[PDB]
C-alpha cells in the first residue's frame, strides 16, 4: 500500500497538515484513553518526544510503500548524549513509555555520532509494534529497555550495543545495519526466572555501505549475566567475527544461540559461548500467547 493522506480519524502533522510538529499532535491528544492515531507527513522533524499517552497510539509515516522502511521520508531528529543528558533514556530522541503503541514507516535517529551513548529510541512498555521504521545511531541506537516488542521490516543501524536492554523482543524480516566495530546486541536479563528472549528471525546483518568490517562484529555481549539471544533463519555476512560473541559483565553465563543461518559470518566452527538448541523459538515464547491480538498481521 502507499500511504499519503491521514488514514481515516487520524491527526495531521506536516507543513500542510493541523500540526506543524509532532509534538504538537501528540500534546493535543491530551488525557484520552481512547485509541488515537497521528499522521505525519513528509519532512525532517527536530523535535525529542516522549510517547506517554494513556490509550493505543498509532503513529504514521507517509510513504510509496509501506511494506517497506526504504521509501520513508519522516525523519525524526535529535542530538545529545547520555552524559550531557543525564541518563540513556534522557538522551532518546523517541522515547516510548505508552503500552501498545504502533509506528509505521518513520525513521528515528540520534545525530550523536561515535564518543559516547546516544539512544536513537528507547521501548519501555509493553505490545509495542514498528514496522518499517529506520532506527540510527552509533553506540546504543535502539534501547529494547522493557516489555514485550515486535520489529518487522525495520533497518537498525548501530556499532556498539545498539540492540541493548531487557525487552523480550522480536526482530522479523529486519536489515540489522553495523556502521562500526563492536557487539550488535546488548541484553541485561539478570535472572533466571526472567523469561524474555531477543529473537532475531529472517533479519540480514549487514555492514553500513562504504564501511569495512570483516570480522570485527560480534552477534552480542552479556550487558547482564543471563542475557539471552537467538539468530534463526537469517543471513549473517562476513562482518561477524568467528567467536561469535564477546565479553562484558563479569561471571556472565549467557544463554547464546544460532539456529539455521546462512551467509559468510554463519561458520559455527570457532564460535564461544553459545549454547546448543534443535529448532527455532516462536512468538509465543517470545511474547506470549496474546501476541496474535497486538501484532500487525495484515502487514
Ligand atoms: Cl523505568
Not at 522515547?95 to 564518543?115: A, H, R, T
Not at 546488548?186 to 549487514?206: F, H, L, M, P, Q
Request: proline share 2%; glycine share 10%.
Amino acid at each position: 500500500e502507499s500511504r499519503t493522506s491521514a488514514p481515516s480519524g487520524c491527526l495531521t502533522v506536516g507543513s500542510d497538515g493541523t500540526y506543524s510538529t509532532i509534538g504538537d499532535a501528540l500534546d493535543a491528544l491530551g488525557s484520552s484513553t481512547s485509541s488515537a492515531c497521528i499522521y505525519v507527513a513528509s519532512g525532517t522533524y527536530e523535535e525529542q518526544l516522549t510517547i506517554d499517552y494513556a490509550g493505543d497510539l498509532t503513529l504514521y509515516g507517509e510513504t510509496t510503500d509501506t511494506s517497506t522502511y526504504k521509501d520513508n521520508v519522516v525523519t525524526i531528529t535529535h542530538t545529545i548524549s547520555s552524559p550531557d543528558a543525564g541518563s540513556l533514556d534522557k538522551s532518546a530522541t523517541v522515547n516510548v513509555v505508552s503500552d501498545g503503541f504502533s509506528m509505521y514507516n518513520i525513521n528515528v535517529e540520534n545525530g550523536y555520532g561515535e564518543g559516547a551513548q546516544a539512544v536513537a529510541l528507547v521501548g519501555n512498555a509493553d505490545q509495542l509494534g514498528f514496522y518499517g521504521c529506520q532506527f540510527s545511531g552509533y553506540q546504543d541506537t535502539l534501547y529494547v529497555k522493557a516489555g514485550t516488542q515486535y520489529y518487522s521490516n525495520c533497518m537498525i543501524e548501530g556499532a556498539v550495543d545498539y540492540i541493548f536492554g531487557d525487552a523480550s523482543v522480536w526482530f522479523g524480516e529486519c536489515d540489522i545495519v553495523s556502521n562500526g566495530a563492536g557487539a550488535i546486541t546488548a541484553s541485561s536479563r539478570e535472572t533466571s526466572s526472567d523469561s524474555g528472549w531477543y529473537a532475531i528471525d529472517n533479519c540480514n546483518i549487514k555492514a553500513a555501505s562504504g564501511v569495512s568490517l570483516t570480522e570485527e562484529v560480534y552477534l552480542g555481549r552479556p550487558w547482564r549475566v543471563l542475557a539471552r539471544v537467538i539468530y534463526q533463519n537469517s543471513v549473517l555476512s562476513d562482518i561477524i567475527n568467528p567467536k561469535g560473541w564477546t565479553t562484558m559483565a563479569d561471571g556472565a553465563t549467557p544463554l547464546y544461540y544460532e539456529y539455521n543461518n546462512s551467509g559468510a559470518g554463519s561458520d559455527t566452527s570457532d564460535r564461544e559461548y553459545e549454547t546448543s538448541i534443535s529448532a527455532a523459538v516462536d512468538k509465543t515464547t517470545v511474547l506470549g500467547e496474546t501476541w496474535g491480538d497486538w501484532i500487525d498481521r495484515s502487514y
